[PDB]
Design a protein around this ligand. Sequence first.
Ligand code: FAD
Ligand code: FAD
Ligand code: TDL
Ligand code: TDL
Ligand code: MG
Ligand code: MG
Lengths: 605, 608
Amino acid sequence: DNKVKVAELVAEALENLGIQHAFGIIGAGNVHLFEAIARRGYTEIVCVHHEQAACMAVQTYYRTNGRIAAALLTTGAGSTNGVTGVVSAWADSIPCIVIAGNENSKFTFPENPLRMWGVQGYDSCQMVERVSKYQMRVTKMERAVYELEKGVHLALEGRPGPTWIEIPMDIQSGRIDPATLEHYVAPPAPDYLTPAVAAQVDSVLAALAKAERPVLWLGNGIRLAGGERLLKPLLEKLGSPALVSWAGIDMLDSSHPLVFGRAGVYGQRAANFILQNSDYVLAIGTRLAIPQIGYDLNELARLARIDVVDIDGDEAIKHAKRTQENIVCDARVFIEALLARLNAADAPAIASKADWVAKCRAYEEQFPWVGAEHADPEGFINSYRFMERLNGFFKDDQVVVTDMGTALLSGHQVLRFKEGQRFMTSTGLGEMGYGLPAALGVSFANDRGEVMCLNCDGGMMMNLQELQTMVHHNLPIKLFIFNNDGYLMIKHTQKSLFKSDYVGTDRKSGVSCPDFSRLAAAFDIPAYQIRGWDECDATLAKVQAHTGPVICEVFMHPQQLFSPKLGVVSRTLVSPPLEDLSPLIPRDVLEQAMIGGMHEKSKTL
Amino acid sequence: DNKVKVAELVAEALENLGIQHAFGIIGAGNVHLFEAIARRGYTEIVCVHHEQAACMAVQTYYRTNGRIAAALLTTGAGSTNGVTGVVSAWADSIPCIVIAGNENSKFTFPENPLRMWGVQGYDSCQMVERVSKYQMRVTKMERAVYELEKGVHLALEGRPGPTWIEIPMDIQSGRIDPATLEHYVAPPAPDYLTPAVAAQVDSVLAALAKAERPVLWLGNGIRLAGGERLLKPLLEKLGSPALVSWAGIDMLDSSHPLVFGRAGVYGQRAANFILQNSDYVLAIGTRLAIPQIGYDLNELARLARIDVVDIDGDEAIKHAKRTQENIVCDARVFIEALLARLNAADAPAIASKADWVAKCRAYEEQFPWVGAEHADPEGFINSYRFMERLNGFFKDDQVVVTDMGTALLSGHQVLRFKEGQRFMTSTGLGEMGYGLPAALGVSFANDRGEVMCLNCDGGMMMNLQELQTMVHHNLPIKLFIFNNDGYLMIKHTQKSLFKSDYVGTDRKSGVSCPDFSRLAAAFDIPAYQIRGWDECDATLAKVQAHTGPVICEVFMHPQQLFSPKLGVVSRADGTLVSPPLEDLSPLIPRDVLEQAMIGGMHEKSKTL
Ligand SMILES: Cc1cc2nc3c(=O)[nH]c(=O)nc-3n(C[C@H](O)[C@H](O)[C@H](O)COP(=O)(O)OP(=O)(O)OC[C@H]3O[C@@H](n4cnc5c(N)ncnc54)[C@H](O)[C@@H]3O)c2cc1C
Ligand SMILES: Cc1cc2nc3c(=O)[nH]c(=O)nc-3n(C[C@H](O)[C@H](O)[C@H](O)COP(=O)(O)OP(=O)(O)OC[C@H]3O[C@@H](n4cnc5c(N)ncnc54)[C@H](O)[C@@H]3O)c2cc1C
Ligand SMILES: Cc1ncc(C[n+]2c([C@@](C)(O)C(=O)O)sc(CCOP(=O)(O)OP(=O)(O)O)c2C)c(N)n1
Ligand SMILES: Cc1ncc(C[n+]2c([C@@](C)(O)C(=O)O)sc(CCOP(=O)(O)OP(=O)(O)O)c2C)c(N)n1
Ligand SMILES: [Mg+2]
Ligand SMILES: [Mg+2]
């Protein structure tokens, strides 16, 4: 008998695909796959306590060293519990593969008239049909490996994202002759550099050469394309300033002479003035999302031509009313072509941007990222200043992941990163409870390495249960929890709208959180507190020195403002242009800051 | 100048619909609805810490007192987080309504070529298309209330289920002349009792009058139809023994002289023998799911005719190869129709079933629910024996919810209930982490009332965050946690399949759980531990006496068997036989099985 169990061929296929880690929860629907994978000993199965955490962990796992991980979900609630993680990978263009079990294949077909399949199954492929790149239900044993190979390829192809492969129970346990396995062969990669795309590169170079105040907007699509190592030669060979999106912060040293921060709705004052006063904007590998460009294209860089580079055609033209050259090309290939034309013997002459570069620096001097607006309040540490202090304790290869809330905003508006350091979170979907699972994925991607997790009192609750996963594997995760009596981010929203008592956002309005230090002791986790500046530096040094997991509660003002921020101002109400962040600077100052004078909307504020 | 905010109209609608509780989490996508509901003060918003818990709590909220609740979710992950709750209410035919916000309506159209809508939005309606009864996105302000009234009616009509109404932000904050508000008029309620169905009731009454060994199988569909009070007079009038489905345990007093327990793959030995030796089976409001009838229809009640009553046409005929009368009718309407024909003048004479009833009681004397197979394993408390002991501490108005695992299996195989007591869980989907959200639903339904939650160390983790919601509202939830070093249910599964070391099921194999008494202290929750019989009664009396939340860890053997269980029997050379439904493991001696089966035992059981 030359037949082999399908589950064992699946485990073999995982090793040949380089998948060394799998996150998930066991159940009757995937018990065969757990056994075959565990007995083969190549892929380590990380058991979590909510499938949601499994489909989030696989994202930051890949982002760390570029190796895809698998989420291993069982029938029914095992598959539904993973859907949030699938969407956040879909929204952030992060490749991963879900392997979901299900009832016996005799029940699994859409035409089944009953509400549910078999005992507790459903059509998991239909549920993620609009939030994944590919879904398939293996119905023939001989195709199980075919679909896993295809599932992985489509996840990494083009615009990356999650794929969903469902293998019914009886397909896992069947037996076939290994020579009857079908294998998927990937088609040749597309050659983006066509004559058309070449003429677009030539147009960009022309504009770059002539532009007096250029600004490059660089995004995580460059890293997904594997070209972030070309950014230093490119910036210095152009001499042009550069902004980085929140997702692409770690692609360049925040202290590089030509990198001037991050702009947007929660941008940095210095970075917004840089973008809004430019005469040419080249977006590479950045989605130009609403939090990046505001709420009106006619107010975005009103003196500048805007070109875009993006591997997704639909994302590349979504601003075609405002943009000029919409380049559908891989970010790396595009940067190589642009460098190839800069290094050519017949390269055009690049006019000097020295005055512009000098004006950008002046912007950063007039508007420091942590400024007078961030003063401490009434017996509390200002979360922005704490981030500046905490920044001084990063290790040379530090990795930081954040949840939403204070950690997300204070983090991305302040923290600086060097080469070798990483910054990760989920911004496409922006879901609470992404922090802890994000740390798991990084830690396992670096052989149970260290990860700093900037979290919040609210977001900690969504996936609280993953503290047990953390202690179980003794993961060196340094977990900072910003306590502020509930949903501080929503507090500011409902106050701006209604200017009345809080509703469902603090302890008095129905939302409370536990004492996370008492909780840490229950999990055998060493806990600390930071309430003032006296014990700060000594506390930070001890947290960073621990070998295992640590919790460190950071208490802030229950109503601290998030600023700078592009908010609505009451003149009637007005939505100011991108440059006029709140709290509002004096008009005469803004007038001098704007090359062509302030926007009509600002004059009356 | 004479316009009202749409959100304020929605808040007004919820009061007119009698929705007094709404579970959810706030966010940009539904901040206007939170405001408007709270200002009006009619509907209490309960804030949970994972949207999944809001979509589970609305379920057991309804089943308690028959009042629907809302789930209030927000854009993006606020909606995706609730899907699991939607699917369990879909699988258990439990009504409820989800009101989910979303990005501005100019982004929310399926033709949008981008991966996501606006900032963080998606088509929340498409994602639940196949696991909910109705989904609609409100795109005109004037129909916002129309779709809520429609959603609540569709959730409650026919076979109840969840409905999903999505309202973009800008629709919530919009303002309209209230005169322009459209309202939903429900179509006329169907008349199930047509001449064709009336003829099927006659056929059933003919079979019941003639049958010598009849068995009624009563399910939660009866409760959902509002006809549970008709059961006691029906069984007594017919003199027919009756079984109850796991979900419908609390419809009849378990000690009623004609109620003989629960059958299935995890059924009681006596219940299975009663089912498999009958000559007529009348199933009313029960789905006859795989865990109830086994894996072969041809092996189910091999001496009986089987009739089925169910309001879902698709469920009523799914066993049509084997069943005879497939009656598509509301359960209460059917029972009322059968009671009218029973009490009529021309009602046929009901042949005596006294001998069958006696044989049903001999079965229960021969096979008690807690028997020798439930012996304490080597210095531990057997969960089945703990459930029997725990049963005697139930209050008169006790409500018991369970999670999966030991709480589910040992609870539904041992626990007995009387009128006034309720038993709830999620059996359709069978998701871990249902216990705590369930106890919230019941507690708020009964105005912060007391609830006993039978939970497990593994299942406690899926929604551990809801211990905070329990403390924040001082809900008198009595939380029992069965500790057994991980996923005991799965240990048996992989052991029967692979007969090797555990994988992903206990601490040694990658799955551990915290000390829940030490967490309890962290949440300011009193906690007890029951490791042996010696201190057991004194603890249980303490737990029941508490006025606020309490935790009690119950320690069992990390490899205790779950029995009786219809399970596979394996052989040395790789052979395995799936025995018939009556032949539950651990297998009883063949000579005793032969005498218990009327036509002798099944061929499969002879060589076992
Ligand atoms: C409350 C909030 C506030 C925010 N504020 C800001 C802010 O002030 N400033 C800011 O910059 N961001 C901000 N963000 C984040 C921002 O809105 C986006 O979520 C994202 O982080 C922008 O960075 P990105 O374009 O690199 O990421 P992504 O949105 O993931 O962009 C990746 C893009 O690259 C493309 N791509 C993928 N692979 C390739 C490839 N191989 N070749 C070429 N292109 C490829 C993708 O198609 C996509 O268009 C905020 C988010 C939130 C939730
Ligand atoms: C591991 C496991 C083991 C189990 N073991 C057993 C076991 O041994 N024995 C057992 O009995 N159960 C068992 N169950 C539960 C069983 O499989 C079902 O999930 C269910 O609990 C059986 O009860 P029910 O048919 O009343 O519930 P449901 O499945 O909810 O049945 C409701 C039915 O009534 C219909 N209905 C709804 N409203 C109306 C109305 N107004 N009028 C008429 N009909 C209506 C519905 O369409 C549906 O068909 C087990 C579950 C699990 C997860
Ligand atoms: C799962 C889930 N539920 C709700 C939300 C909505 N939501 C937010 C956003 C970013 O999505 C938003 O509305 O802008 S922000 C937010 C509050 C976060 O509170 P935390 O205590 O975690 O952080 P702080 O705001 O720093 O106190 C919530 C509930 C969300 N993002 N994810
Ligand atoms: C969310 C989720 N994830 C996985 C499962 C699978 N699953 C079960 C079933 C019932 O679905 C099954 O497969 O039969 S049972 C089960 C183990 C539950 O372990 P617990 O420690 O809670 O209970 P005991 O088994 O009594 O120890 C798991 C993981 C599940 N039910 N729900
Ligand atoms: Mg908070
Ligand atoms: Mg367990």
